[PDB]
Ligand binder design. Structure first.
Ligand SMILES: NC(=O)C1=CN([C@@H]2O[C@H](COP(=O)(O)OP(=O)(O)OC[C@H]3O[C@@H](n4cnc5c(N)ncnc54)[C@H](O)[C@@H]3O)[C@@H](O)[C@H]2O)C=CC1
Ligand SMILES: NC(=O)C1=CN([C@@H]2O[C@H](COP(=O)(O)OP(=O)(O)OC[C@H]3O[C@@H](n4cnc5c(N)ncnc54)[C@H](O)[C@@H]3O)[C@@H](O)[C@H]2O)C=CC1
Ligand SMILES: NC(=O)C1=CN([C@@H]2O[C@H](COP(=O)(O)OP(=O)(O)OC[C@H]3O[C@@H](n4cnc5c(N)ncnc54)[C@H](O)[C@@H]3O)[C@@H](O)[C@H]2O)C=CC1
Ligand SMILES: NC(=O)C1=CN([C@@H]2O[C@H](COP(=O)(O)OP(=O)(O)OC[C@H]3O[C@@H](n4cnc5c(N)ncnc54)[C@H](O)[C@@H]3O)[C@@H](O)[C@H]2O)C=CC1
Lengths: 267, 267, 267, 267
C-alpha cells in the first residue's frame, strides 16, 4: 500500500459524503493507521466511521476551542501509543456562516460572522499544525483542503476570501513545518456534492445562489480536459494520499489541483 | 491636472511619512478636491494635513466602528455639498497587532489579534466600499494599498495573510462596484520607510525581524529593473492617482504593482 | 495633455480598426508627437494614417528583416531630428499562420509556421527594444500588446503559446531597458473586433473556431464587472497611453489588464 | 511498486547525471517496464543505460527530425509488442544554443538560435504527444520537465522564454490528451547539477553567468522550507513517478513543483 505503516490523523468527517470520509477510506485501503477527529456530533461521527475499512479512534476537536487544541497532542499520543509519532495530518475543516455565502449580499456579512468563518477555515490550519508538529516524524506531511480562490465567483463570497487566507497560511506553516522535516500543502479540489453542497444547490441559501453554483459546476466539467465528476470524491482522496506519501518529497508550501484540470483552461 | 474636478476621499494619513499623505499631496497637485478621514488622533492628523497644498475637511473614521461607517456617507455629502458625489476613494488602512508580526512566532498569534488585523486591513475595504458606493459617480474608482502576499516572507507573518485576504476582497468589491460603473483595484507597493516601518527596521518588533526586513528591502532594490527607493513614496502616490484617473478605464478587480518591477524578477 | 511633449513610435497600424490606430489617435489627442512604422503595405498605411489628428512620418519595418532593424534608429533620428530621442515605443505587432490558429488541429501546425508566428509576435518585442533603447530618453516607456495566455483556450492555439513567450520576453527586456531608465510593460487587452478578428468570427479559419471565439467573447463581457465592449478599442488605447505617461513610474516587466476585469472573475 | 505493470517511454538520458536517468531508475525500481529514446549518441546512451536496474530497448529520437517522429509509434509498438500500448511518457528534453544563455547579451541571440531552442525545448512536447497518444492507454500520463519561468532570472535568458512557451504548450496538449483519457503535466524542478549545469557553473558560458547561477542555487536552498539539494535528482524523479502513477488522477494541464518549496517563499 501507498501508505503502509504510516500513522495519519484525519479531521473533518461529518457524513458519509464528506471528502474526509473518502480520504480516510482510501488511506486505510493503502495501509495507513488512522486517528480521527470530529466536531460536536461525536455519536453521529462514530456511527459514520464504523463503516470505514478498519477501526480508528475518534477524538473530539473543536478547532475554536483552546483546551481541545492544548490537549490534542497528548490525546493523540495516548491513542497511538507512547513513543509513536504521526506521519500525516489531514485538515478537512471549513465553515462560513450563511450571512457570508449565497444570496445574502457580499456587503451584508457582519464581521463577527466572517471572522468565525476565517477562524475555522484558515487560522485553524495553523492551530492544528502548532498542536501536531511536536508529535510528527521527519518526512511527514500536513495536507489541507482548498477551493481555488484566485478569481472571485458568485455565491461563495466570504468563503472564497477564507480560502485566499488559507493559501497564505499554508505558505507560512510550510516554513514552520520545515524545521521538523515536515511538508505542508493544500489540495484544491473541484466542486463536490457533499450533503451541505447538495442542500445549497437545492436552494438552502436562496434560489439564485443555488442556480449560480449549479452553473459553476457545469462549466467545470466542460472546461476540464479529463472531465470532472462532482459526485465522486475518490480522485480527490487519492490526491491527498499522494501528498501524504513519500512520492512528492520536494513539494511544500504548495497547492496541488485535483480539479480535472479545469483551472488551466478558460473555455 | 490628471484629476481636475474630481472629488476624492483619502483615508489613512497618520504622519507626514504616511503613503496616504503623499497620495493626498499628489492628488491635490493634480487638481483633485479632497475629503480626508482619520483614525483616533484627529488633532494630530489635522496638524499634519495643514501642510497639504490645499485645505481639506477631515472626518473621523474608525473602520471598526459601525456607527462611524453608518454615518460616513452623510458626513461626506455634508462636507462636499448636497447634490455632489465622490469620484474616488483611497483605502490606505492597515494594522496587525504585534503578536501577528515580527519575532513573535507565527503560531503564537492568538486569533483575537489576527482577527483584529484582518478586520482593519481586509474586511474594511469592503466596509468602506459599502459605505461610499451609494455616493459615488459612474466612472469612479476605489483604490486600496496592497503588499504582494503571493509568497511567504519573514516577519510580516499574519499581515501577509491579511493582504492575501484583501486581494480576495478586492475582487468581490469589484463585482459590487461594477453595478455603479465604479472600478476597484489595489496598488501593490514596494516597502516604504514610514514611521512604523522605520521603528520596525530599528528593532521595535525584535532584532531578528528588523534584520530580516532590512534584508528584504535590499533585495528589492537589487531585483527591481529600475531600482526601488524605500525613502520615496511619490512613485506609489502617482500610481494611485493613475488608477483614480480616467486613464485605466478597463481595469477592475485587479492589482497594479508599484514596486520597481521587483516582483517580476527572481534575482 | 497626458503625453505633452513626448516623442512616441507606434508600430502595428494596418487598418482603421487596428488597436494601434486608436493608440496613435489617443496619443496625439494627448499631445504626443508620433513616428509610425508600417509593414509591407505602406501606401495603404499612409492612406489610413492620413485620418489621424496630426501628420506623422511613416517608416517601413518588417520585424523579420535584419536590415530594417539595423537601420531603424537612424531612420527614426532623421524623422524626429538629430539630438532628439524617443520617450515611448508601442509594439502592436502579432501574427500566426493559419495552420497555428483555428480549426486546424493544434498538433498539425508545422514548426516552420509556429516559429514564424513566435518570431513576429514574441521575439520582435526584444528586436525592437534592441533597436530603439539606444535612442530612448531616461523615464521612457516601451509597451506591447498581450492577450492573457495563462489558461489555454479554443482556436487561439499557437498564438496563445506565442503570447506566453511574449510575457517572458517582456520580463527580460525590462532588465535591459532598466539600464536606460526605461520601463517595459504589456497591456493584456480583452478581445477586440479588428478586421482580422471579424473575419475569424465570420468563419475565415473554419466554422467551429468562429463559433468558439464568439462564445469566448460573450463570456468576457459577462465576467467583466464593468462589462467589455469588443467594438471599442479606446479603453485599451487609453491604457497604453497611461503606461506611456509618467504616471506609472514604478511599474516594469509587468502586465496591465485592460479587459473589463474579466480575468479576475470565474463566472 | 508504484508503477507495477505500466509501460513507460523515457526520453532525455545523455549521461548518468541526467534527470531522466534517475527518472528511469526510480520507475524501474517501482515495477515499470521502460522504452528509452536517445538523441544522436546512441552508443554512449546504451553504455549509460546498461547501468539501469533492468534492460530496456533504446530507440533513436531526434525531436527535430520529422521521419523519427513519423516512425516513432511503430518502433515503440515493435519494442513493446503488438497489442500493447504505453501508459506513460516522459519528456526530459531541453536545449538552447549558447548565444541564448549566459553572458551573451539577451538582445544578441539571433532568432535562428532561439527558434532551435524553442523547437527542441517547447514545440517537441507537442510533437511527442502527437506521435504517442495514438499508442497510449486510457488513464495514461505524459510528463515534461519545467524550470519555473514566471519571473526573469540572470543567465537563463532565452531558455526561460522557452520554458514559458513549454508551460503554454502543456495546457494545450492536455486538451488533446484528454480525448484519450490521458493526463499531461510538467514537473518544475529546482536546479540540478547535471553535467551541462556543472560546466556552466564552472564558467562554460562565461564567468559572470557562472557566478549568477551559483548565486541562484544558494538562494534556492535558503528559500526552500525543506531545503534543496542540487546534487540529488531523486526527489524530482520520485515526483515524475507520482504523476506517472494512478495517484494524481484529476490533475492535468498543470505544473507540480519539485523545488523544495522555494517558489512559495520570497526570502
Ligand atoms: N465540497 C466541495 O465542493 C469542496 C470542499 N472543499 C473543502 O474540503 C474541506 C471538507 O469539506 P467538505 O467535505 O466539502 O464538507 P463537510 O461538511 O463534509 O466537512 C466540513 C467539516 O468541517 C468541520 N468543522 C466545522 N467547524 C468545525 C470546528 N469548529 N472544528 C472542527 N471541525 C469543524 C465539520 O464538522 C465537517 O466535518 C473543507 O475545507 C471544504 O472547504 C474544497 C473544495 C471543494
Ligand atoms: N509601508 C510599506 O512598506 C507598505 C505599506 N502598504 C500599505 O499602505 C497602507 C498605508 O500604510 P502606511 O502608509 O505604510 O502606514 P501608516 O502607519 O502611515 O498608515 C496606516 C494607517 O492605517 C490607519 N488605521 C489603523 N487602524 C485604523 C482604524 N481602525 N480605522 C481607520 N484607520 C486605521 C492608521 O491610522 C494609519 O493612518 C496600508 O494598507 C499598508 O499595509 C503596502 C505596501 C508597503
Ligand atoms: N484584436 C484582439 O482581440 C487583441 C489583439 N491583441 C494584440 O494587439 C496587437 C495588435 O493587433 P490588432 O490590432 O488586433 O490586429 P491588426 O491586424 O490590426 O494589427 C496587427 C499588426 O501586426 C503587424 N505585423 C504583422 N507582421 C509584421 C511584421 N513582419 N513586421 C511588422 N509588423 C507586422 C501587421 O502589419 C498589423 O499592423 C497584436 O499583438 C495582437 O496580438 C491583444 C489582445 C486582443
Ligand atoms: N538541470 C536542471 O537544473 C533542470 C533541468 N530541467 C529540465 O530537465 C530536462 C532534462 O534536462 P537535464 O537532465 O537537466 O539535462 P541533460 O543534458 O541531462 O538532458 C537534456 C536532454 O535533452 C536531449 N536533447 C537535446 N536535443 C535533443 C533533440 N534534438 N532530440 C532529442 N533529445 C534532445 C539531450 O540528448 C539530453 O538527453 C530539460 O527539459 C531541462 O530543461 C528543469 C529544471 C531544472
Amino acid at each position: 500500500g501507498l501508505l503502509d505503516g504510516k500513522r495519519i490523523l484525519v479531521s473533518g468527517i461529518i457524513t458519509d459524503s464528506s471528502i474526509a470520509f473518502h480520504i480516510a477510506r482510501v488511506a486505510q485501503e493503502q495501509g495507513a493507521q488512522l486517528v480521527l477527529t470530529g466536531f460536536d456530533r461525536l455519536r453521529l461521527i462514530q456511527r459514520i466511521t464504523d463503516r470505514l475499512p478498519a477501526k480508528a479512534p475518534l477524538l473530539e476537536l473543536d478547532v475554536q476551542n483552546e483546551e481541545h487544541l492544548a490537549s490534542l497532542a497528548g490525546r493523540v499520543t495516548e491513542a497511538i501509543g507512547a513513543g509513536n509519532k504521526l506521519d500525516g495530518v489531514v485538515h478537512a475543516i471549513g465553515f462560513m456562516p450563511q450571512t457570508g455565502m449565497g444570496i445574502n449580499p457580499f456587503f451584508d456579512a457582519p464581521y463577527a460572522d466572517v471572522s468565525k468563518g476565517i477562524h475555522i477555515s484558515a487560522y485553524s490550519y495553523a492551530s492544528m499544525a502548532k498542536a501536531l508538529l511536536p508529535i510528527m516524524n521527519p518526512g511527514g506531511s500536513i495536507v489541507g483542503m482548498d477551493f481555488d480562490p484566485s478569481r472571485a465567483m458568485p455565491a461563495y463570497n466570504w468563503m472564497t476570501v477564507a480560502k485566499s487566507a488559507l493559501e497564505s497560511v499554508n505558505r507560512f506553516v510550510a516554513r514552520e513545518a520545515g524545521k521538523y522535516g515536515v511538508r505542508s500543502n493544500l489540495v484544491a479540489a473541484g466542486p463536490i456534492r457533499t450533503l451541505a453542497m447538495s442542500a445549497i444547490v437545492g436552494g438552502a441559501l436562496g434560489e439564485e445562489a443555488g442556480a449560480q453554483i449549479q452553473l459553476l459546476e457545469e462549466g467545470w466539467d466542460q472546461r476540464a480536459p479529463i472531465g470532472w465528476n462532482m459526485k465522486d470524491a475518490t480522485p480527490v482522496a487519492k490526491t491527498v494520499c499522494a501528498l501524504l506519501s513519500d512520492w512528492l518529497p520536494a513539494t511544500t508550501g504548495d497547492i496541488i489541483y485535483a480539479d480535472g484540470g479545469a483551472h488551466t483552461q478558460l473555455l
